[PDB]
Design a protein around this ligand. Structure first.
Ligand SMILES: C[N+](C)(C)CCO
Length: 128
């Protein structure tokens, strides 16, 4: 599965771009978790953080969540509570992988950690 030359595999934290929406954090999942069908070649199934729904998204419309400051949308973040909730669950998942520990208020330092480049592991720590 996902043997098509393009990147991103199961478990990868990514940003996903759907028409009409900001880049949104997601996890790449196997089609078996979706209750649907296999993804077409060059597509990935993702599960979106925040609402837990599934979309078949092209790999050209995905980037690693580690490319954070370049895809984090600050306007959308200020405008939409769903996007903030999405960011929380995405970064929380990121934190546990990277073995990072912290002391809306919970978000603030995870956001800073993410925006600052996921110190000290860097993006390496975000891998599944
Ligand atoms: C995460 N999006 C809002 C882009 C789609 C949710 O199903």
């Amino acid at each position: 599965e996902y043997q098509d030359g393009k990147e991103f595999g199961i478990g990868d934290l990514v940003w996903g771009k759907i028409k009409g929406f900001s880049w949104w954090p997601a996890m790449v999942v196997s089609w078996k978790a979706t209750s649907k069908r296999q993804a077409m070649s060059g597509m990935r199934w993702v599960q979106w953080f925040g609402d837990g729904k599934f979309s078949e998204v092209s790999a050209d419309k995905l980037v690693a969540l580690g490319l954070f400051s370049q895809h984090f949308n600050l306007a959308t973040f200020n405008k939409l509570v769903s996007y903030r909730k999405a960011m929380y669950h995405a970064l929380e998942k990121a934190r546990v992988r990277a073995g990072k520990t912290f002391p809306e208020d919970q978000l603030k330092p995870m956001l800073e950690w993410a925006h600052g480049g996921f110190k000290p592991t860097g993006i390496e720590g975000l891998k599944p």
